[PDB]
Design a protein around this ligand. Sequence first.
Ligand SMILES: Nc1ncnc2c1ncn2[C@@H]1O[C@H](COP(=O)(O)OP(=O)(O)CP(=O)(O)O)[C@@H](O)[C@H]1O
Length: 706
Amino acid sequence: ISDRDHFQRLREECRSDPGEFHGRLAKREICWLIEGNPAWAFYDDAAETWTGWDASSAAPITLDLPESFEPWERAFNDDDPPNWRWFEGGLTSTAFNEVDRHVLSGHGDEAAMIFEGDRWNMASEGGRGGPVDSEVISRRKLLLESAKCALALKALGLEAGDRIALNMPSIPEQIYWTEGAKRMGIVYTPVFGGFSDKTLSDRIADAGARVVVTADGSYRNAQMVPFKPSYTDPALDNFIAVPVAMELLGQALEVVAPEHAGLIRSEVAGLLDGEVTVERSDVMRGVGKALTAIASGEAAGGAMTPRQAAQLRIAIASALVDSPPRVDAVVVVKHTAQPDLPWNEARDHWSHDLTAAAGEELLKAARDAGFDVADEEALLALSDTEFVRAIWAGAPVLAVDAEYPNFIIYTSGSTGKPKGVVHVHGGYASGVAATMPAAFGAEPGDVMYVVADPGWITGQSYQIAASLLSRVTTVITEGSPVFPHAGRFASIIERYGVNVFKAGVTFLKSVMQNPENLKDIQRYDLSSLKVATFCAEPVSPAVQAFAMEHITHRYINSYWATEHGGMVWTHFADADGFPLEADAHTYPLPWIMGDVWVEDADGSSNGPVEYERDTPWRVAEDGEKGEIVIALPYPYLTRTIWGDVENFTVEHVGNLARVAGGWRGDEVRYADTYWRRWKGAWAYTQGDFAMRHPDGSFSLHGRSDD
Ligand SMILES: Nc1ncnc2c1ncn2[C@@H]1O[C@H](COP(=O)(O)OP(=O)(O)CP(=O)(O)O)[C@@H](O)[C@H]1O
C-alpha cells in the first residue's frame, strides 16, 4: 500500500466519503469474524477472495460477495454531532490480528519482538558494546505467554468488561499481559513508571481497576529502580477515592447536630473538589477546619461539647483508615529480583506463579481435545496450525464489537486532572495498520525500533499495535536510546538491522551538545535504516538536517497526539509529488481533512465543513499561525473520554462480546474539549499552533492551550 502521485492524494481525499473509503481498507488490513460456521477472514488482493481461518481450527477461503461484502452492519455512523461509530456490528479483536493471525498464517517462528535490557557491556561486540539481557520472542511464544496471561486474568476473577491497571517497565512481560488482556476483552490502562504514586492512584480509581499488574523493579541507566514498593504499594495503601472518603464521612457522622454535620461535609468537599484520590490526612485537615469553626460558635449556631468534637475526630479517623480494599489482587513480575521486597500476602501474586498455573490449565485443555502434550516443550513442537488449535482449546479468543474499548490511556489536559481517552478494537487497529505502508515502506518481515514506553501512545499504537498488526518485528527497549553513550540507539539499529526508526527530538538535541557524541554514533552501521521519523515535540530544521546527514536521509517529521490514535500528519513512502526538505514540514494524510483556522472577531465562519451546527473564525491565510483542526472524523480517532462507568456493561455470550447500547463514556466532556471550539462547524481541535503552506504542507509551532 502507498499513494503514488499528487493526483492520487486528491483522488483519495474526495473519494474519502468516510464509510466506503475506510471500509475498503479495513476489510484487508485486519481480520473480521464472518459467518456454515464462523471464521476469521479478510479480503486478500493476491487471492481476490476472502482468505482466513476457521474459528475452531484451520484454513479455508470464503467467497461470499467479496469486494462488496461488509463484515459489519454499518461502516460509518454520523448521527450524533461528534459521537462517531465506525464498523458497528463487525466482530474483530486487537489480540487476534496482533498475535493469533500471524502464527495461524504460518509465521509462528517469526520474530514478533526483540527485547533489549538496559545494562550494557562496553567490551562486547569487540569494543562496540552489547546488551547484558536480550531475547528474541517468536510469534508462537507471544501467543503462548499471552494466552497464559489471559487465563491468569480469568483465574483472578476478571470478566470481559472489567478493568486492570498496568504499572510496568518496557519489558516483554507487559506485552504478554497486554495482549492477554485484549484476548479476554479486559480493558487496561498503561501507567508509565515516571509518574507518581498519586497519579497511579488516580488512574486506578477512575478506571475502576480491581487488579493491578506491576513489577518488582526495572533497570534505568544500569541501576536497580524499585517499582512496586515505590508506586503500586503507596498508591493502594496511602490514598482513597474522594467519594469513598465522603461515604465513610457520612457513616462516621451517623449523635450529631445536623448543622454541624453539614458544615463538615462541605468543608472537606471544597478541599477535595477536582481531586480523584487523596491521602486520608487531607480529609482530616478538612474536618479540623470545620470543628474549629464550630467550637468558635460563630457558624450555624450550635456548640459542640469538647467531648463530642473529640469523639467525631475519632469516628472519622477510624473510618478512613479502616477503608475497604481498593484492589482484589496485584500481580508482580519478578524482573530485578532484589532482596527484601515488601510483600502483602493478601493481594500480591508473583506473575510466574499465575502464568505457570495458566500453562497447566492451557495444557490440560489441549489434552482434553486430544493433542498429547505433557509439557510446554511438547506444545512448542506442533505445527503452526495445530499449535494454535491447541491454544484455542483452553484460551479461545474473544470477538468484540468494533466499538469495544481496547484500552484507556491518560493524557494531560489544559484544565483539571488528566483524562483517559478510549480507543476501540475496530477502527483503531485498521487505522494504524494502514499508516505503516502509507508513511513508511513497511512490509511484513521488516524491523521497527520505536523509542517509547507502553505508557505512551507511541508505545500502544506503534511499538506494539502497528508492529504486531503489520507483522513487523518491534524492538522493545527497557532503557534510554542514549544510555550509556549517544550511540546506543545506533547500536540497536546495527545489530537488529532496524529498517524504521520512530522517536522524539530531545534525545538528538542532547546528542548535538558536544561533538564527541556524534563520533559515538558514527561507530555503527545504520545502512539498514530506510526511514526514521520525529514525532513527540517541535523539531527545528537544524535537528532534522543533522539527523538527515548522520542517521538516514529520509528522516521525516510526523505529527499526532494521544487522541489521534495514530499518525495523521507525516510523509508518504514512494510518492512523487511530495518532496522532503529539512523544514520540519508534514503532510496531512488523504483521509485527514486538516486545515488551519483562527479566531477573528469578524467571522465568515464558512470554511470546509462537512458537518455544521448552531449554538467567530476564518480559514487562516497561508503562513498565518493559528489553530490546527480536523474537519472530518476518521476511524482510529478516540471516541470518548472514559466515564459513565455505572452504565458500562458488556454483553458476553459465548466467545462474542459487545457493549450494551446506550453507553458513550463522558460524551459531554468529550465534545466540549475537542469539538465545540468553532461556532458553526464540527471539527476536531487538538490545540496546536500550525500554519498551512501553498504546496499543501503544514508546520507546527507548539501547543496553543495551557
Ligand atoms: N511532529 C510534531 N511536531 C510538533 N509537535 C508535536 C508533534 N507531534 C506531537 N506534537 C506535540 O505532542 C503533543 C501530544 O502529546 P501526546 O503525548 O499525547 O502525543 P505524543 O506524540 O507526545 C505521544 P508519546 O508520549 O508517546 O510521545 C501534541 O499535542 C503536540 O503538542
